[PDB]
């Protein structure tokens with residue numbers, strides 16, 4: 001058993017999947033050893049108190065209705081004790097680089113830092129939402145899941161995606177060493193169903209050059 005080269009995974013699987021469905025799941029992305037190291041680094045972030053409630057990020061005010069029960073932190077990838085998260089981010093970047101110019105009409109020219117997120121069980125989730133509804137430049141959502149032996153039947157935590165205007169929907173279990181791509185805009189409203197166990201994931205959003213520039217123009 002051998003890893004597929006990034007170029008081959010990108011052009012033979014990710015590009016066609018994305019252009020046909022707007023969603024692409026890649027399992028066994030990095031392997032057990034690396035995935036476990038990433039899990040250790042995320043758990044260290046959690047135990048040392050680096051997470052902030054995601055509700056604080058998404059709410060309009062402290063009176064707003066509940067949106068999300070996760071806790072998050074932003075990782076650049078070069079921080080001490082986050083080197084393996086940095087390797088994950090470089091691996092994502094390599095796939096996108098081999099895709100660029102073939103994912104719809106997008107020209108991807110940047111990305112966010114990594115959003116490390118924890119749903120601490122207790123029935124927490126994330127109401128249905130669109131990641132980028134107002135044209136802030138993000139065109140692709142990329143999520144890496146880190147949860148060993150996750151049993152959705154008992155622990156829940158399914159990501160459910162409802163592709164706009166299609167007669168289908170997708171259920172993504174937050175499985176260990178799974179990589180997920182999907183269009184960030186209104187085409188993919190999605191929700192995280194209540195999680196009854198600790199659920200970790202790492203997300204990066206990629207930027208489309210033209211839309212991000214236009215967003216900067218409205219910005220100014």
Ligand SMILES: O=C(O)CNC(=O)C(=O)O
Nearest residue numbers: 126131143159190192201
């Ligand atoms: O963690 C997941 O499966 C999905 N998370 C989100 O939709 C988000 O944080 O915006």
Ligand SMILES: O=C(O)CNC(=O)C(=O)O
Nearest residue numbers: 023025169170171172173
């Ligand atoms: O089928 C889809 O589009 C997404 N879900 C999966 O890849 C799975 O549950 O294995």
Ligand SMILES: [Mn+2]
Nearest residue numbers: 129130131190
């Ligand atoms: Mn989302």
